[PDB]
Ligand binder design. Structure first.
Ligand SMILES: OC[C@H]1O[C@@H](O[C@H]2[C@H](O)[C@@H](O)[C@H](O)O[C@@H]2CO)[C@H](O)[C@@H](O)[C@H]1O
Length: 138
């Protein structure tokens, strides 16, 4: 498959209408997954499913600027399942990232980092087997 952590360059940054698709399988005793859209050392959008935060499943989203995390946005709808295959799609819209999992809308994250053309790498990490990571324009 692909080695994790995996770094997917996004040449020239992100732009509205760009669709990123990630296919993989959650490992059986997974603890976390993370997608990190980076602008240099900053993390424009961190998407972090947590399988056991105080015995609860939660998705945490945030931005890291100058090595400091901002205000978390938390989602209790949790579509990932230990041991099972998933598809994550991230659609860049003008004002938000829009995330769908297994073809169902999950969340939207308003752009905090506004220089979209400078968000030029995606890091994929955590307790997954990674099958495919790619992008296209819709
Ligand atoms: O916000 C994303 C960021 O969270 C860090 O963990 C936070 C944690 O979510 C919060 O409840 C606690 O009070 O502070 C921790 C440290 O900032 C993670 O360490 C980091 O990897 C990101 O996931």
């Amino acid at each position: 498959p692909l080695i994790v952590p995996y770094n997917l360059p996004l040449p020239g940054g992100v732009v509205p209408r760009m669709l990123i698709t990630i296919l993989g399988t959650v490992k059986p005793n997974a603890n976390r997954i993370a997608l990190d859209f980076q602008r240099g050392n900053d993390v424009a959008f961190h998407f972090n499913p947590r399988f056991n935060e105080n015995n609860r499943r939660v998705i945490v989203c945030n931005t890291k600027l100058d090595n400091n995390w901002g205000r978390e946005e938390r989602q209790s709808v949790f579509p990932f399942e230990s041991g099972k295959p998933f598809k994550i799609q991230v659609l860049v819209e003008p004002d938000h990232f829009k995330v769908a999992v297994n073809d169902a809308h999950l969340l939207q994250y308003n752009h905090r980092v506004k220089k979209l053309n400078e968000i030029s790498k995606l890091g994929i990490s955590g307790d997954i087997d990674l099958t495919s990571a790619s992008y296209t324009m819709i």
